[PDB]
Amino acid sequence: RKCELQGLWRNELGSNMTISALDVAGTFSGSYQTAVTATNKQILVSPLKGAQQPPGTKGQQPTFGFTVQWQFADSTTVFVGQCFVDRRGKEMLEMAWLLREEVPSRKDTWKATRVGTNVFTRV
Amino acid sequence: RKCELQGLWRNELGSNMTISALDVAGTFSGSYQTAVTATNKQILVSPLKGAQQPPGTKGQQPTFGFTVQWQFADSTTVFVGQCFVDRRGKEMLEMAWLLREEVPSRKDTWKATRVGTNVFTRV
Amino acid sequence: RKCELQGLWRNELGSNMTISALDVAGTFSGSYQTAVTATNKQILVSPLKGAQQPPGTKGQQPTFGFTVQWQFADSTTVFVGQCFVDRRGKEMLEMAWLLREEVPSRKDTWKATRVGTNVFTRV
Amino acid sequence: RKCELQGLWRNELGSNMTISALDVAGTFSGSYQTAVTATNKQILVSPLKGAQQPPGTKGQQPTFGFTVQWQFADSTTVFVGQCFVDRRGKEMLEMAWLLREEVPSRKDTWKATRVGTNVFTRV
Ligand SMILES: O=C(O)CCCC[C@H]1[C@H]2NC(=O)N[C@H]2C[S@@]1=O
Ligand SMILES: O=C(O)CCCC[C@H]1[C@H]2NC(=O)N[C@H]2C[S@@]1=O
Ligand SMILES: O=C(O)CCCC[C@H]1[C@H]2NC(=O)N[C@H]2C[S@@]1=O
Ligand SMILES: O=C(O)CCCC[C@H]1[C@H]2NC(=O)N[C@H]2C[S@@]1=O
């Protein structure tokens, strides 16, 4: 089915992710291979956990989000988004994300969160 | 233990959330009772799914995130953050969030995502 | 003059903007013709006001930001970004933005702010 | 003059800012003394430039935004917000911000932008 989250996706940065089938409650797992890191550590495949809303009846794909638990950094990213299918059946996940760094003190919390967007296409 | 995610939390908006114990992989579930909605629907307790990094050894709490699958809206929120413990042992979760609305077309994606911050204290 | 902000730009949504010459302090003015709106109002050209950092000497273009005072809406947008010149000399402004709605009370501030990204190319 | 931007403000991080009188077009200037920095540089007073919407007639203060050109860093911040007067007449600016780092290449743009919120009270 078009825009099913399950499967292999790639974003404009060259990152890849695999999403599992959805459980009955719309929960899913997956793995994320980022192309880029703000750290200087070697990148390792990392697990993700999320949930997607059940589909409506208006020809629109439901919203979803997940958390990436990076295996090589102390940071955590969450992504939230919605899939779209164009005229030609090409699927795209439009996503926004927040990347949270682990900071030394509460006084540094103001600087801890970066934000961005990604677009994923089906591999 | 201080800053253990498991338990009952409340934010400045008056929202409440319960977080489960962490599984071995640092995955957790929970429920979220928001005080506020951008919709005009009646608020219903909603499930959450997330993951937390394992703790370091520097006296700092690890980062974490989760997804809220709202039971009364087509939207999805993700939250990402870090707990802090003050001089007096009062715990606070410092969080940033993105709220994603389900939009009718890809051309409306630009307007689909709101952003904010919350601070949770232990109930 | 590569990556000189002064001039005419268009982003991926079809929005156009004109930036005036920078004054000595790096402040500038301009106009912004958005292709899209979250309102049901007729879009009208709107003024912008901003500032850019002095160029450094390392071959990297300086960061800059601006505010757009929409003439057809009660909201305000801020854009912040940096210009890049590709291998062929083509200029792109990579920007992130926040769109702030005017809300009826303080309790409503939580839902007031949308976030996104745009890329502009020279017209 | 309740919620008149002109004047002196301090936020929860200890930052101070002075906003000049608004000109007829609602544009303004000012200075910003941040208490905190993501750099290891000595903080220096920095100029801001912004704009505010014309007051409506519904008893709600208009949205506004500004850019801060940090004098001690290569980054730029944009703030966007709205003033509120509480039951006792106390004014608070509820603001969200983006802090854009200058990055060495375009490929690095993804990590360039931090986001957060501040609340200002009249000094
Ligand atoms: O560097 C880190 O702290 C962990 C790796 C973060 C990779 C980021 C980057 N990769 C990607 O595919 N989209 C952006 C948003 S994700 O936080
Ligand atoms: O209105 C909706 O679309 C679903 C409910 C969203 C509640 C928001 C609001 N509640 C809260 O505790 N923090 C903020 C961020 S959450 O998206
Ligand atoms: O609808 C409104 O409230 C005012 C118009 C906002 C247009 C938005 C939209 N147009 C554009 O070029 N980029 C995005 C970010 S801007 O806030
Ligand atoms: O360190 C830098 O790059 C420049 C200074 C940035 C200070 C930040 C910090 N100060 C403040 O009052 N609110 C937050 C958001 S502002 O970007």
Numbering used by the authors:
A (entry chain B), B (entry chain B), C (entry chain A), D (entry chain A): 2 to 124
From the manuscript:
Here, we expand the repertoire of known macromolecular biotin binders by reporting a novel biotin-binding protein A (BBP-A) from chicken. In the present study, we show that the chicken BBP-A gene encodes a functional homotetrameric protein. The BBP-A structures consist of four identical subunits, each subunit adopting a β-barrel fold of eight anti-parallel β-strands with an α-helix positioned between the β7- and β8-strands.
We report two different X-ray structures of BBP-A, one in complex with BTN and an other one in complex with D-biotin D-sulfoxide (BSO), at 2.1 Å and 1.75 Å resolution, respectively. Surprisingly, the affinity of BBP-A for BSO is even higher than the affinity for BTN. Of the three residues (Val116, Gly117 and Thr118) within 5 Å from each other at the 1–3 subunit interface of the BBP-A – BSO structure, valine and glycine are conserved between BBP-A and AVD, while Thr118 is replaced by Ile117 in the AVD structure.
